[PDB]
Amino acid sequence: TCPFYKKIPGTGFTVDAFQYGVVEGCTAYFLTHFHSDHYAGLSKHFTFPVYCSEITGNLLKNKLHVQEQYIHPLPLDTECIVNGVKVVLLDANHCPGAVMILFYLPNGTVILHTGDFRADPSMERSLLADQKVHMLYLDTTYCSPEYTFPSQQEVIRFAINTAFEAVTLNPHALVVCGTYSIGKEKVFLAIADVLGSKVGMSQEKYKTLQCLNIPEINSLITTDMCSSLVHLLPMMQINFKGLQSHLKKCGGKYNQILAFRPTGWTHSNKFTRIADVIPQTKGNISIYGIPYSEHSSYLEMKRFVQWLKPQKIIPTVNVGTWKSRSTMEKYFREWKLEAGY
């Protein structure tokens, strides 16, 4: 049955709640972003109103074939009325099209649902600064102090400099980047830009990217693999067997692979600086795991919450075990005593 942390009190609304069948009393289903753990259940046969960003609504229509008449895209940073309730969508700094949702309840309560987010000081200057938030439905994916990671900018600098050096030393090396969902597009686009190449990919992944309103995308991506020296493959194929196989298919055009796996976190971060990352190598194949995250680090999350000062926090991730839930609640209390709210 639908869990309570997917339901918005004082409304008929749910958030990211498409796999429970007809939720009793639900008048509007919001979708924060196009990741499968959140959209699971949507299809061309869904006949209730879905509220989302423009980009998410492009992906709904084109990838899942949801009918247009049930897709209700909203502009960002704009006060809108849904079934008599004021709402605002804000940029979540997650994947393309991903939003946070502010709900202004008829009784005066204000609720923020972060969806999935990577907290940033730029959010301290959005429409969130303009009123008090009483309840926060928080993406707690990395809510424990061991989760540190570098900025996205530092990680992309490492990736660009590594690829540029490799291919200038060996003009016959191929660069491969893994993916399994939307998100993290800067990794492969930034490398193709420094190399003077388009990114080559499957027809299905090219279609997905053409839904994202990314400026000058026709200039950076292609389905012609022959004309490209940066290839995108499914994340499952980013291993020595899968890469050796791919290299066979390129017909002697290339004699080396440099591959990137943008993971969220890996425990090499507790010790290792970004400067100190090394690949796994077998033969003429090297694989780099880079810590490119689209979720808040522990410190990023803590700063956002200590700035917002919510009256009540509802975690939406890691809620399945009693030790996880109790540990998160103890961090929330620390933050509140340290900050004075």
- Binding-site ranges for Ni ion (CB under 5 A): 35, 116
Helix axes 54-63, 203-210, angle to 10 degrees: 150
Q: How far is the CB of 326 from Ni ion (least distance, A)?
A: 25
**Which CB, 116 or 185, lies closer to Ni ion?**
116
Q: How many CB atoms lie within 10 A of CB 122?
A: 9
Look-up: residue for tokens 């809108």?
80
**Which CB, 184 or 261, lies closer to Ni ion?**
184
256-262 vs 285-290, strand pairing mode: parallel
Q: How far is the CB of 195 from Ni ion (least distance, A)?
A: 29
Whether the Cβ atoms of residue 50 and residue 38 lie closer than 8 Å to each other: no
Q: How far is the CB of 179 from Ni ion (least distance, A)?
A: 14
* Angstrom distance (rounded) from CA 215 to CA 219: 9
**Which CB, 116 or 300, lies closer to Ni ion?**
116
In angstroms, how far is the first alpha carbon of the chain from the final one? 35
**Which CB, 35 or 246, lies closer to Ni ion?**
35
14: helix, coil or strand? Answer: strand
Q: How far is the CB of 92 from Ni ion (least distance, A)?
A: 9
Kind and range of the H or E run holding 171: none
Q: How far is the CB of 263 from Ni ion (least distance, A)?
A: 14
**Which CB, 31 or 313, lies closer to Ni ion?**
31
**Which CB, 6 or 35, lies closer to Ni ion?**
35
Look-up: residue for tokens 């030393």?
169
Q: How far is the CB of 104 from Ni ion (least distance, A)?
A: 25
Whether the Cβ atoms of residue 300 and residue 92 lie closer than 8 Å to each other: no
**Which CB, 83 or 181, lies closer to Ni ion?**
181
How open is the CA angle 218-201-180, to the nearest 5 degrees? 110
Q: How far is the CB of 16 from Ni ion (least distance, A)?
A: 9
How open is the CA angle 235-315-11, to the nearest 5 degrees? 110
